[PDB]
Design an enzyme around this catalytic site. Structure first.
Site, PDB file in Angstrom:
ATOM      1  N   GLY A  83      -2.866  -3.144  -2.217  1.00 28.12           N
ATOM      2  CA  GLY A  83      -1.711  -3.415  -1.991  1.00 28.12           C
ATOM      3  C   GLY A  83      -1.749  -4.117  -0.557  1.00 28.12           C
ATOM      4  O   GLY A  83      -2.718  -3.673   0.329  1.00 28.12           O
ATOM      5  N   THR A 110      -1.461   2.646  -8.317  1.00 26.20           N
ATOM      6  CA  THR A 110      -2.629   3.367  -8.908  1.00 26.20           C
ATOM      7  C   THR A 110      -2.132   4.378  -9.794  1.00 26.20           C
ATOM      8  O   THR A 110      -2.426   4.650 -10.908  1.00 26.20           O
ATOM      9  CB  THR A 110      -3.441   3.948  -7.633  1.00 26.20           C
ATOM     10  OG1 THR A 110      -3.981   3.001  -7.104  1.00 26.20           O
ATOM     11  CG2 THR A 110      -4.528   5.096  -8.266  1.00 26.20           C
ATOM     12  N   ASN A 170      -1.642   5.575   3.341  1.00 28.76           N
ATOM     13  CA  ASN A 170      -1.746   6.262   2.020  1.00 28.76           C
ATOM     14  C   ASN A 170      -2.933   7.329   2.235  1.00 28.76           C
ATOM     15  O   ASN A 170      -3.909   6.815   2.433  1.00 28.76           O
ATOM     16  CB  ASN A 170      -1.814   5.469   0.863  1.00 28.76           C
ATOM     17  CG  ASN A 170      -1.837   6.180  -0.295  1.00 28.76           C
ATOM     18  OD1 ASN A 170      -1.859   7.122  -0.494  1.00 28.76           O
ATOM     19  ND2 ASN A 170      -1.936   5.313  -1.609  1.00 28.76           N
ATOM     20  N   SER A 174       0.833  -1.163   0.041  1.00 34.27           N
ATOM     21  CA  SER A 174      -0.151   0.270   0.066  1.00 34.27           C
ATOM     22  C   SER A 174       0.913   1.112   0.000  1.00 34.27           C
ATOM     23  O   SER A 174       1.473   1.509   0.886  1.00 34.27           O
ATOM     24  CB  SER A 174      -0.814  -0.058   1.093  1.00 34.27           C
ATOM     25  OG  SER A 174      -1.504   1.217   1.347  1.00 34.27           O
ATOM     26  N   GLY A 175       0.728   1.951  -1.066  1.00 29.08           N
ATOM     27  CA  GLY A 175       1.632   3.303  -1.064  1.00 29.08           C
ATOM     28  C   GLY A 175       2.843   3.227  -2.029  1.00 29.08           C
ATOM     29  O   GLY A 175       3.539   4.242  -2.163  1.00 29.08           O
ATOM     30  N   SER A 229      -4.812   5.963  -1.257  1.00 25.24           N
ATOM     31  CA  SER A 229      -5.332   4.457  -1.158  1.00 25.24           C
ATOM     32  C   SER A 229      -6.627   3.879  -1.474  1.00 25.24           C
ATOM     33  O   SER A 229      -7.616   4.219  -1.052  1.00 25.24           O
ATOM     34  CB  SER A 229      -5.368   4.200   0.429  1.00 25.24           C
ATOM     35  OG  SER A 229      -5.730   2.797   0.630  1.00 25.24           O
ATOM     36  N   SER A 230      -6.486   3.035  -2.604  1.00 23.07           N
ATOM     37  CA  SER A 230      -7.320   2.514  -3.186  1.00 23.07           C
ATOM     38  C   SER A 230      -8.204   1.493  -2.261  1.00 23.07           C
ATOM     39  O   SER A 230      -7.623   0.485  -1.983  1.00 23.07           O
ATOM     40  CB  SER A 230      -7.222   1.891  -4.503  1.00 23.07           C
ATOM     41  OG  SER A 230      -6.190   2.665  -5.362  1.00 23.07           O
ATOM     42  N   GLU A 245      -1.371  -4.550   3.109  1.00 21.66           N
ATOM     43  CA  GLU A 245      -1.352  -3.660   4.233  1.00 21.66           C
ATOM     44  C   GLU A 245      -1.363  -4.341   5.736  1.00 21.66           C
ATOM     45  O   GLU A 245      -1.901  -5.458   5.730  1.00 21.66           O
ATOM     46  CB  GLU A 245      -2.417  -2.503   4.244  1.00 21.66           C
ATOM     47  CG  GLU A 245      -3.762  -3.484   3.939  1.00 21.66           C
ATOM     48  CD  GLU A 245      -5.112  -2.350   4.004  1.00 21.66           C
ATOM     49  OE1 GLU A 245      -4.740  -1.523   3.060  1.00 21.66           O
ATOM     50  OE2 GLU A 245      -5.996  -2.456   4.528  1.00 21.66           O
TER      51      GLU A 245
HETATM   52  N1  LIG Z   1       5.145   8.582  -9.903  1.00 26.52           N
HETATM   53  C1  LIG Z   1       4.590   9.143  -8.759  1.00 26.52           C
HETATM   54  N2  LIG Z   1       4.943  10.852  -8.865  1.00 26.52           N
HETATM   55  C2  LIG Z   1       4.296  11.612  -7.949  1.00 26.52           C
HETATM   56  N3  LIG Z   1       3.751  11.099  -6.797  1.00 26.52           N
HETATM   57  C3  LIG Z   1       3.234   9.736  -6.680  1.00 26.52           C
HETATM   58  C4  LIG Z   1       4.066   8.746  -7.763  1.00 26.52           C
HETATM   59  N4  LIG Z   1       3.562   7.380  -7.599  1.00 26.52           N
HETATM   60  C5  LIG Z   1       3.145   7.634  -6.445  1.00 26.52           C
HETATM   61  N5  LIG Z   1       2.979   8.963  -5.968  1.00 26.52           N
HETATM   62  C6  LIG Z   1       2.579   9.290  -4.654  1.00 26.52           C
HETATM   63  O1  LIG Z   1       2.242   8.171  -3.793  1.00 26.52           O
HETATM   64  C7  LIG Z   1       0.740   8.180  -3.398  1.00 26.52           C
HETATM   65  C8  LIG Z   1       0.250   6.759  -3.504  1.00 26.52           C
HETATM   66  O2  LIG Z   1       0.494   6.309  -4.781  1.00 26.52           O
HETATM   67  P1  LIG Z   1      -0.503   5.077  -5.074  1.00 26.52           P
HETATM   68  O3  LIG Z   1      -0.332   5.174  -6.504  1.00 26.52           O
HETATM   69  O4  LIG Z   1      -1.885   5.590  -4.694  1.00 26.52           O
HETATM   70  O5  LIG Z   1      -0.223   3.807  -4.421  1.00 26.52           O
HETATM   71  P2  LIG Z   1      -0.894   2.555  -4.431  1.00 26.52           P
HETATM   72  O6  LIG Z   1      -1.871   2.423  -5.605  1.00 26.52           O
HETATM   73  O7  LIG Z   1      -0.093   1.501  -4.516  1.00 26.52           O
HETATM   74  O8  LIG Z   1      -1.732   2.602  -3.185  1.00 26.52           O
HETATM   75  C9  LIG Z   1       0.187   8.972  -4.651  1.00 26.52           C
HETATM   76  O9  LIG Z   1      -1.113   9.321  -4.612  1.00 26.52           O
HETATM   77  C10 LIG Z   1       1.041  10.143  -4.764  1.00 26.52           C
HETATM   78  O10 LIG Z   1       1.148  11.065  -3.821  1.00 26.52           O
HETATM   79  O1  VO4 Z   2      -3.113   2.201  -0.726  1.00 33.41           O
HETATM   80  V1  VO4 Z   2      -3.083   1.347  -1.982  1.00 33.41           V
HETATM   81  O2  VO4 Z   2      -2.008   0.073  -2.055  1.00 33.41           O
HETATM   82  O3  VO4 Z   2      -4.407   1.771  -3.387  1.00 33.41           O
HETATM   83  O4  VO4 Z   2      -4.186   0.255  -1.625  1.00 33.41           O
HETATM   84 MG   LIG Z   3      -3.973   3.342  -5.206  1.00 40.38          MG
END
Ligand SMILES: Nc1ncnc2c1ncn2[C@@H]1O[C@H](COP(=O)(O)OP(=O)(O)O)[C@@H](O)[C@H]1O
Ligand code: VO4
Ligand SMILES: [Mg+2]
Length: 650
Positions: free
Chosen positions: A367, A100, A146, A95-96, A149-150, A369
């Site tokens: 992801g 996404t 996050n 997660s994070g 966080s999806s 967590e």
């Molecule tokens: N390529 C990137 N450029 C800028 N910020 C990013 C990038 N990848 C992730 N982030 C930061 O990380 C946060 C979490 O990323 P996210 O894609 O939501 O993670 P996950 O889908 O794995 O939970 C984002 O919303 C953003 O603030």
């Molecule tokens: O915080 V993310 O891994 O979308 O679930």
């Molecule tokens: Mg996400």
């Protein structure tokens, strides 16, 4: 540093981390492991996702440019165009880690090189893209790990025609964490839309809804005590969602139809109960809220009230607890349905039924967590990450290697540590976690506790599962059980596991909604959540194994969202449980491409002087056999270049 780890001087975990840390610190998020993309969350904007960059990687080969997310998309697209087969991008990470955002960079690319000027092409493109902000508003929330966080699994399918144009797309969503609406970890926040609506709608629409612009004013939102996020701009954000609503064909008619339900859920949360010392039964206290709720849901205020205080032509009164339970059960059902509706509603405008063509799927799941207190939701999310991990292995490590011998190519079996299909097994079929929890639901006498005993007895002679009882370890609470996931140990609290898996809503509540006059409400109301999610996952996995894989593996840089910072240990852990080193290793000892035989013949003849063919063509082109091995049915070419040679000659 060094792009693509296969080029590491000394192939060792330490080398790996040193190279990765080096790149990251200098804003080089992406690095390869031969076609696999490894990315490290920057935690800040890197001006490297500009259309010009899109144009730069378009068409070009992986070696012609710096490692980038686009190179993966470009390969996926080109391959689809070429073989005319389905492609799928599987993105993994805690997660994070940034899954996404990566899935969006991948679409942005596809939905662009894919169109051109074709206004029609880029029109639907605009739609596929606007679908993200839309779903993100209702499915995302600020957890402690996050800010975005999806909270739902998603599989986005890009639909193209033989010519390679965007013709549409269909979204597939997976079990949403609906419990987040009624309760969440203090500090955390509920779904975005709630907060954004409260700061986005006009004081007019707000009053018509009986709402007041102030999250603290609502029970459900007040609980977790957190209403703002420096990272998010609720007010400005709401304006975006509304645009998206329209780009997707949800006029102010539909928008308002939605708003009511959200407002209803908010009012429902403020319904209090009192000891109806009249017989003793229980009755609603904060009546005005119960009035506002029935007002938005457009149903009989009374029938509702009665559904919250009695069961069922016989009405059995229930205590201040069962009442509060049903209240929350209703709110949860409403949101879950509204969300599932919202996706299909979108799929209606986006999914192309007319034409048939190749597809490019993109996977974006919640992801792995681990929180202070992990419950049923976490078990599923993690279980889902376990399956995904199992898939990468079955493909990326096990499969590839298992071929090398099956074809008979002298191979030093590189043992990829944990195979982990055992963490699955411990929770799927007859005598598995969700199967026991399922069957335990049938026995109307059993309780969360009696279920814990089943597990603890049935297992714990099986690794991956511990408990205070057998493995006399105080770390495991008395109502918990330890599960040794592929990504670390997690302690689940059995509390509420039964009613969570049961996932039941009494007919009185259902009927009270069907009785609604709002076309939407009644629309929402025209097999254990566990076993059901288990199907969704196995279905998802069989479909991903029907496309050409493309892998992206996100690594969370640190747990503080600090830009340009590496958490040595933390990252070392991921690099280890992911098996990235056992990847560079295989990639080394192994060969670049293993082109089948008959596929070489009927393709690389012109170069050749007029599996027999195979050989002849090589001999007449001089290539150190220490670069190619002849298989029983396929040819192998160690390095990329010694393959670009032939192909760049056509
Ligand atoms: N390529 C990137 N450029 C800028 N910020 C990013 C990038 N990848 C992730 N982030 C930061 O990380 C946060 C979490 O990323 P996210 O894609 O939501 O993670 P996950 O889908 O794995 O939970 C984002 O919303 C953003 O603030
Ligand atoms: O915080 V993310 O891994 O979308 O679930
Ligand atoms: Mg996400």
């Amino acid at each position: 540093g060094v792009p693509d780890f296969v080029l590491l001087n000394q192939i060792t975990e330490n080398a790996f981390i040193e190279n990765l840390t080096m790149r990251h610190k200098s804003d080089n998020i992406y690095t390869y492991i031969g076609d696999v993309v490894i990315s490290t969350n920057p935690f800040k904007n890197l001006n490297i996702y500009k259309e010009s960059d899109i144009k730069a990687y378009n068409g070009r080969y992986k070696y012609e440019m710096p490692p980038h997310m686009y190179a993966l998309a470009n390969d996926a697209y080109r391959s689809m165009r070429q073989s005319q087969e389905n492609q799928c991008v599987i993105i993994s990470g805690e997660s994070g880690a940034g899954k996404t955002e990566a899935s969006k960079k991948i679409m942005q690319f596809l939905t662009f090189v894919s169109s051109n000027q074709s206004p029609n092409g880029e029109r639907i493109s605009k739609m596929l893209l606007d679908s993200n902000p839309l779903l993100e508003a209702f499915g995302n929330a600020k957890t402690l790990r996050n800010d975005n966080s999806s909270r739902f699994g998603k599989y986005m399918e890009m639909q193209f025609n033989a010519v390679g144009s965007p013709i549409g797309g269909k979204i597939t969503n997976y079990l949403l964490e609906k419990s987040r609406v009624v309760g969440r970890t203090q500090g955390e926040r509920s779904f975005h839309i709630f907060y954004q609506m409260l700061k986005g709608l006009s004081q007019s629409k707000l009053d018509e809804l009986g709402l007041t612009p102030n999250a603290p004013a609502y029970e459900y939102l007040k609980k977790s005590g957190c209403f703002d996020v420096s990272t998010i701009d609720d007010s400005g954000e709401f304006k975006i969602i509304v645009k998206a609503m329209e780009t997707l064909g949800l006029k102010e008619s539909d928008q308002n139809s939605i708003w009511r339900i959200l407002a209803a859920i908010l009012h429902i949360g403020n319904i209090t109960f009192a000891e109806a010392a009249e017989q003793t039964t229980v009755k609603v206290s904060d009546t005005k809220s119960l009035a506002a709720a029935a007002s938005c849901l457009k149903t009989d205020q009374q029938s509702l009230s009665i559904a919250l205080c009695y069961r069922s032509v016989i009405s059995v009164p229930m205590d201040c607890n069962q009442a509060a339970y049903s209240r929350d059960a209703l709110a949860k059902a409403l949101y879950e349905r509204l969300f599932n509706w919202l996706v299909s509603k979108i799929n209606t405008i986006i999914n192309c039924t007319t034409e048939k063509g190749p597809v490019i799927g993109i996977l974006d799941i919640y992801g792995f967590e681990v929180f202070q207190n992990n419950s049923f939701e976490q078990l599923n999310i993690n279980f889902c990450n376990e399956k995904l991990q199992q898939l990468f292995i079955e493909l990326t490590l096990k499969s590839e290697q298992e071929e090398y011998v099956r074809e008979g190519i002298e191979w030093k079996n590189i043992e990829y540590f944990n195979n982990k299909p055992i963490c699955e097994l411990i929770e799927k079929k007859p005598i598995g976690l969700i199967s026991l929890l399922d069957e335990a639901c049938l026995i109307a006498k059993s309780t969360d506790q009696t279920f814990l005993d089943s597990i603890c007895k049935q297992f714990e002679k099986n690794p991956h599962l511990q408990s205070y009882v057998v493995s006399k370890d105080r770390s495991i609470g008395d109502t918990c059980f330890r599960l040794k996931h592929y990504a670390g140990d997690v302690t689940y609290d059995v509390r509420g596991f039964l009613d969570k898996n049961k996932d039941t809503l009494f007919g009185d509540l259902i009927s009270s909604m069907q009785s609604s006059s709002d076309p939407l409400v009644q629309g929402l109301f025209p097999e254990t959540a566990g076993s059901q999610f288990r199907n969704a996952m196995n279905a998802l996995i069989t479909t991903l194994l029907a496309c050409s894989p493309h892998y992206v593996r996100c690594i969370k840089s640190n747990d503080n969202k600090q830009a340009g910072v590496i958490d040595e240990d933390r990252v070392r852990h991921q690099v280890r449980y992911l098996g990235l080193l056992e990847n560079v290793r295989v990639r080394r000892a192994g060969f670049a491409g293993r082109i089948e035989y008959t596929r070489f013949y009927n393709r690389y003849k012109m170069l050749c002087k007029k599996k027999q063919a195979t050989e002849l063509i090589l001999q007449q082109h001089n290539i150190d056999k220490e670069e190619i091995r002849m298989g029983k049915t396929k040819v192998f070419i160690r390095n990329p270049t010694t393959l670009f040679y032939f192909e760049e000659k056509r």
